[PDB]
Amino acid sequence: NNLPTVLESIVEGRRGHLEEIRARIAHVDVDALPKSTRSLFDSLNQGRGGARFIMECKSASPSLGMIREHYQPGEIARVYSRYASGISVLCEPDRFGGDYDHLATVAATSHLPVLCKDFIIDPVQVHAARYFGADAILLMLSVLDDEEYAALAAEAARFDLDILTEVIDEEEVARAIKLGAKIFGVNHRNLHDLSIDLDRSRRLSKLIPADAVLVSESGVRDTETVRQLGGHSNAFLVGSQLTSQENVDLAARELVYGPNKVCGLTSPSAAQTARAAGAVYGGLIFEEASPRNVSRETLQKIIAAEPNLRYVAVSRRTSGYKDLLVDGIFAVQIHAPLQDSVEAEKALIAAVREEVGPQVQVWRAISMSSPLGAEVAAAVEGDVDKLILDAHEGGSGEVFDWATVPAAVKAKSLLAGGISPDNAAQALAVGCAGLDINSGVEYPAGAGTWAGAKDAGALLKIFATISTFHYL
Template sequence: MSVLDDIIDGVREDLTARRSRVALEEVRALAEQAPAPRDAFAALNASNSGVRIIAEVKRKSPSKGSLSEIQDPAELAAAYERGGAAVVSVLTEERRFGGSLADLDAVRASVNLPILRKDFTVDEYQIWEARAHGADLILLIVAALPDEELRALLALTHELGMNALVETHTPEEVERAVALGGRIIGVNVRNLKTLDIDRSVFGTLAGLIPAGAVVVAESGVRDIADVEQFVAEGAHAVLVGEALVRHENPEATVRTFTRAGSALHN
């Protein structure tokens, strides 16, 4: 069984437990009362300067264990916003990433930016839940689900006025993401089946994504040189977790990364 399959099994179990506490109808009612979603596509698409940074609140990971003792996700997210992040990503998966919906709530209350609820989305319940907790963008991992299910989840996302970051790792997955109508397409340079990083995957796959889509490079950014490289290879936005949560000054790091692309891009 791959790491991805294993993570998804845990996600489904946790989902069953949440669903028995809060019924889908209740979550839908909360989603309908939530303030209107922010336009994450527009936030990521503005292309007149620099690279957009999607700054992630990430406590731990299956490959590295604990990354940082994040005492206050709200304060971290506020630092990302001050540094010029375009979107804040909040990992809500609990077992492997140590996240929660409480982290999402804390971040929603502290920033004005669009928020990505970063989780292994396998069920429409999670999309209603994301909206109920104020998220504007959700993650759909192409490797995790067959096309019919992805299509239904993407349709619900758009119906609720949200956007999806459609994540790929192979040329076939990019083809599927494009055929499904993904407007924000991510290339994760980490293979979720093995957890190995291969930064060269980004350049190979970015060229397969048609104009009009927002192209996001995900994972493996260590420093400004990595950001520059992804931008030179066609990234409009770069999603960064570990390098920010480990840094003593996340605000300054986001600011530096944001400027990294401006000389190169268009």
Template sequence: MGGAIPAGPRLVSVLERIVVAKREALRRRRELLPLERLREGLAPTTRSLRQTLRTTPCGYILECKHRAPSGGVLRADYDPAALARSYAEVASAISVLTDEPFFGGSLEHLAQVRAAVTLPLLCKDFVVDPYQLFEARRWGADAVLLMLSVLDDALLRECLALAGTLGMDALVEVRDEAELARALRAGATLIGINNRDLATLEVRLETTERLAPLVPPDVTLVAESGIRTRADVRRLRPLVDAFLVGSSLMRRADLGRAARELVVGRLKVCGLTRAADARTAWQAGATWGGLIFAPHSPRAVTLEQAAALRTAVPELQWAGVFVDAEPATMAAHATTLALDAVQLHGHEPPEVLAALRGALPTPCALWKAVGVPLEGPARAAFTLPAAAALGADRVLLDSQRGSQRGGTGASFDWRGLAALSEATRAELLLAGGLGPANLAEAEALGLWALDLNSGVEDAPGHKSAAKLAACAATLRAAGGSRRGARG
């Protein structure tokens, strides 16, 4: 039942060492727990990873991984159950590394995650024996990874058949055309393309771009390795049904925010006045909240109200919005509230920004809103100022009608922003009339963040949970997938 590493180019020695160690560990485990006892009372799973991915426009399998041979310890405070809970609001499924000597995992980690979340669980290990499928199911897995760099065809077919008996899905991992052909011949219906070259450890997203067109439409396709940013997602999203993401998230201290920004992009919900709305914004996928301190705004909050919101949802990063306020006042608010950014939405000249920057606490960012005329000669004459020229870290573009900047509920024609350089677009936030109807087009611009306000409200300052959820769903699906949502 052991199988052999397939013939072909010599694999990197670390993989060979892993396989040798895995077989020896399995020999010891089988002595302690014979297969007959392991199988006793084992019930098939009722959660389907593949079906979950097939009914989601773009799926995300987010991973719990302690360390890796190529990267060392990825997360010192590794708590797989806590990590899974951080992922749960945006993930389609959770992957758990269970290899112990090389990745610091264990089957017990799988059980801990199973107790923490209800999402489908993928047991990610180096399967060299069908015994491991029984183990994975016993400890709570709904799916297993089968690597064609490790399995020969006979063992692959045996594992696929056993997975079906246990009600489990098998994610069959391939690295090249030859392995893809083997997976398809074996009848794999859930295939992962690993963008990492096991010989060099180099990651190339071109691997998915090369292999994806060869995969039949009835096969569910997952991109693995090298998906670090929202730009990577935009690049591969039309080619695959889902992404498996691990190392890039494990290295982030702000894991919850990192997961949200990968899945829906960087989203700010401005004009928050109620703690319940702030919590709903976070649950929907937003990572920034906006507190308006302009007295004339129907969404204005006091310093005390802002502090209560900040305390109620500390997971959000918070920006304070001011209109022609005194620098000392803005700096005091930023210090008291520990704001992550101050957003100037008035006619503040560069010298005010310079004075404010010197007074702001570290690392509070400084953003300057620029009104973009909706129409007429002023719109034709508009030119985009650089953030540095304004003395700001980033520029927020908002619709302007007459002298009214922001709060118009209307969108200017921002399609031309696509022609800007990547560096310039990375400085920009976009606001003004954004909602479910136009978010997909706005997201495709690749700006630093999108800013929602009136487009997700039932009344000024009262955010709609349904509209926020619709925005999150739109952003998750933006750009489509190989086939979109299917039944």
């Protein structure tokens, strides 16, 4: 074959392990291996049963976001089981650091369909995959002619193993349809020259049967990219971008839902529902003229009861942000009224940056109805970790043009202003990184003693909408 040099050496390496594998399962009655009772096809093809992702366990990775002592595919799988529709496990040993023990660990840990990510050229690899708990296998059309594929697809069918059929182009697509593939793998990375072409998934999805599923891989940087690509890919395969971070659960939430805040938390159970639904950030209001005002006693009970939100201390003050800092406060949100100039805004921010020290993020909240609003936003974007842009302009209506806002500002911004289950799609369409969610998920005035409290049913609905949104 005319394989990229790296792939060439990987399949020839794998050829040279086949005697090991044959000896390793010699004692196994291949004929009597139980079938896989987990359909990767269905998990991927239905909205229910997990978000639009196959999440991958791979040992070999620089992972410079964190200090790696030991590979724990059980601990990774435990977090992935909460978000994904499948788990991928590298079984290749010599350059991915994988093994069949990793596959078995994940199969025993997770309820999801388990994919053996391997370079499969020999039936014994299919047999080993089922014995060690795989529910699906990768077959690469770049490596296998039509006969080699048909034979291995037939070994797979014996045991109800789903196949992820990798295809690089329109010719491989035609071959896959020919061979009746149900799950098409598209890599945006060309292995020959390491070029990324995000379009390769859109372009090939037009040629793929309507009763088939498309999984795409590589260059899926963030939720913004997931939303750009989610119209034509059923699922994204990701891993190293989640396991290379300090907290795999928080990383999973940030990719799937984006950097969303549920503000105005006043109860443990509200913080708990927010985190469970997919919120990354929790908002705590210190201002005492608020119906969402929380005492330092309530603040610390909420943080303690739900440690797995990143908490944001929200104040209307221009200084004294050191007083707000408590264990678990990740960021302070400057909610002070807009100042007189850009320079006063740059100064306020530097003064707060100064108060809280480099271990606490500094966010600026801005009303876009304020005539200086957009100008400050564009000016102060590099000085802050997040902008909270309030896009409900009140009685005037929306005077500001959202088409004029730079991509850099949007990438730094959570959209605010009565964000609710019903206006979520149209808020997401604006193309900001996040949503700031508060009064729009509270019970209304008719709710008796529950009026003004976070409504858990509304939290379930708005996070479901966020999980499936894509640009239309």
